[PDB]
């Protein structure tokens, strides 16, 4: 039960007949029973900075007057 995932290719080797071009994937197999023991996936999300940027109750429209 392997885990094959994709890589974000950086320096593409003058190849598309193996490397660079065609999507490069990597395999990952868990060897231990504990989740702790697992490797760090790194395929983490990203969110909107709004729970910091706009902590406001009403909705902000960046073109209208802030205080009305």
């Amino acid at each position: 039960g392997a885990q094959v995932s994709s890589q974000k290719v950086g320096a593409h080797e003058n190849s598309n007949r193996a490397y660079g071009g065609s999507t490069i994937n990597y395999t990952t197999i868990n060897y231990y029973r504990d989740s702790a023991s697992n490797a760090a996936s790194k395929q983490d999300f990203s969110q909107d900075p709004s729970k910091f940027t706009e902590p406001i109750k009403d909705v902000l429209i960046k073109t209208a007057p802030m205080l009305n």
């Binding site: 702790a36 760090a40 983490d44 999300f45 990203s46 706009e54 902590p55 960046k62």
Partner: protein, 283 residues
């Protein structure tokens, strides 16, 4: 839907303007930070952006292993007056600075701890003495468990204590420990007191230290030299490298400005000057 390795918002072409729209005008009194992108204050060309925030993801930021502690032990001669020094250390990141400061940008967290042990050794006396490759034991004594008294007492028999026998000169020792926190997240800061001073008691019996708790108590590590006494005193250092993996954090705080002093949020005097001199009207 948005991941770490995704391309940031593409800049859109914007031209001349004369409207009833006021991007540039805000009022930080609202607490809200005005969201202004390039195509607002200036005319920008269309840019298919490529930069991604991949390396700035929570996991990535703490993706290095830091040096938490240095534990000293030795193996003195069988004839020495002193006892064979075995190390005992209270498990905490705080003892140093770096790893701590990084963990300070947040109020809380959950992370599976991964440990590393790069041990080193050396002789001490001016004697061309010999020492066979030494064996090392790293013993995890949880809170309230038999902490060793000697380098050779029943305790190290560890019928239930997770230990690590490291044979000097090999690929460093490593173990992984999940979220052992008593809470839901480990509190890097704690506004309070473990006890509450009472009225029909005495100031002594209800006195507690501010900032501490059981939260940050996990146990101690006991390290020794499993080999017996050898004709030549051989000291040894145990470096512990901790690396948080699979991490989450809650509620940001500003980083530690002034130099550290104690495990508390406290600061010493004379170290209260973080900045330098620089003119207001000079670049």
């Amino acid at each position: 839907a948005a991941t770490s390795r995704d391309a940031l918002p593409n800049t859109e072409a914007s031209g001349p303007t004369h409207s009833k729209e006021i991007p540039a005008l805000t009022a930080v009194e609202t607490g809200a930070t005005n969201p202004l992108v390039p195509s607002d204050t200036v005319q920008t060309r269309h840019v298919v952006q490529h930069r991604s925030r991949s390396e700035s993801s929570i996991e990535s930021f703490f993706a290095r292993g830091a040096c938490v502690t240095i534990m000293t032990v030795d193996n003195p001669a069988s004839t020495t007056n002193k006892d064979k020094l075995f190390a005992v250390w209270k498990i905490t990141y705080k003892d140093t600075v770096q790893l701590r400061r990084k963990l300070e940008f947040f109020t809380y967290s959950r992370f599976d701890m991964e440990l590393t042990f790069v041990v080193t050794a050396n002789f001490t006396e001016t004697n061309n003495g010999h020492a066979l490759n030494q064996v090392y034991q790293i013993m995890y004594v949880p809170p309230g468990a038999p902490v060793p008294e000697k380098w050779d007492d029943y305790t190290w028999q560890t019928s239930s204590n997770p230990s690590i026998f490291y044979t000097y000169g090999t690929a460093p020792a490593r173990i992984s420990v999940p979220y052992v926190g008593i809470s839901n997240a480990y509190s890097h800061f704690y506004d309070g007191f473990s006890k509450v001073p009472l009225k029909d008691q005495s100031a002594a019996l209800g006195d507690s230290l501010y900032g501490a708790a059981s939260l940050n108590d996990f146990g101690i590590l006991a390290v020794r030299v499993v080999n017996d006494h050898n004709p030549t005193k051989v000291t040894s250092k145990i470096r512990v490298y901790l690396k948080p993996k699979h991490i989450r954090v809650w509620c940001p705080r500003p980083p530690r400005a002034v130099a550290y002093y104690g495990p508390g949020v406290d600061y010493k005097d004379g170290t209260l000057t973080p900045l330098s001199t620089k003119d207001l009207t000079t670049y």
